[PDB]
Symmetry: C3
Subunit: 98 residues, 3 copies
């Protein structure tokens, strides 16, 4: 029966080796996954930097438009004011004739 116990063990070992050989394939997979997570982390960081640049630039353009709006509204106000003054000079030139 010793000899049966031994044949039994030899089968278990053969099975075990076949299971281990399948499991060993994981080593290379895990390392590959680890490498791919790093690459993703590098792309994520680069997107974050580029989103920041865009955010900054949206904000400056927004400010820029606000400065332009003011600049123009003030020149328009000043031009309308000159026009009003000229209309008043023409009222007086008209009264001065008649």
């Amino acid at each position: 029966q010793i000899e049966d116990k031994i044949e039994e063990i030899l089968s278990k070992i053969y099975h075990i080796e076949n299971e281990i050989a399948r499991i060993k394939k994981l080593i290379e997979k895990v390392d590959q996954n680890t490498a791919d997570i790093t690459t993703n982390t590098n792309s994520i960081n680069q997107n974050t930097t580029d989103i920041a640049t865009n955010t900054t630039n949206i904000n400056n353009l927004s400010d820029s438009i606000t400065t332009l709006m003011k600049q123009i509204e003030d020149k328009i106000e000043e031009i309308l004011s000159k026009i009003y003054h000229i209309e008043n000079e023409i009222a007086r030139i008209k009264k001065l004739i008649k």
Copy 2:
């Protein structure tokens, strides 16, 4: 001869234990990868939310500039119209003199 079978079993086993001890290291590397994937997934989502904000804001500014453009074109044409009416009052005043 049994005894020889037993020694070669004991070396097969010694070898298996060394293989299993290497493979054991994978349990914690996999935990780590899983944690790092979650972190990356959190950053991806934050970038996605920030890209959305930026897209929204680009779109409002673009509309804003369009409103400002027309707003200005109208005031400029009102001004040109007042100028023309002044040019006509001066044609009169010149006539009215001679």
Copy 3:
């Protein structure tokens, strides 16, 4: 000693099996991680394409504002120039009366 050597071996084998069963639980975890890294990679790319769109559009609005600026400032200068020539016609009309 033989039968003792055998009962020892059988429990070393029992433990290797327990260790292997613990390690076989990684197989699907590693597959799941791999699938999740691919998903993340897909989201990263999508974000990259949307950042590029946003970048392009920020830049065109920026240029657009620059074109609008000069367009208006030239129109305003032309209006100021018509106003000045109208002031001069009114200086003449005033001198022509008195």
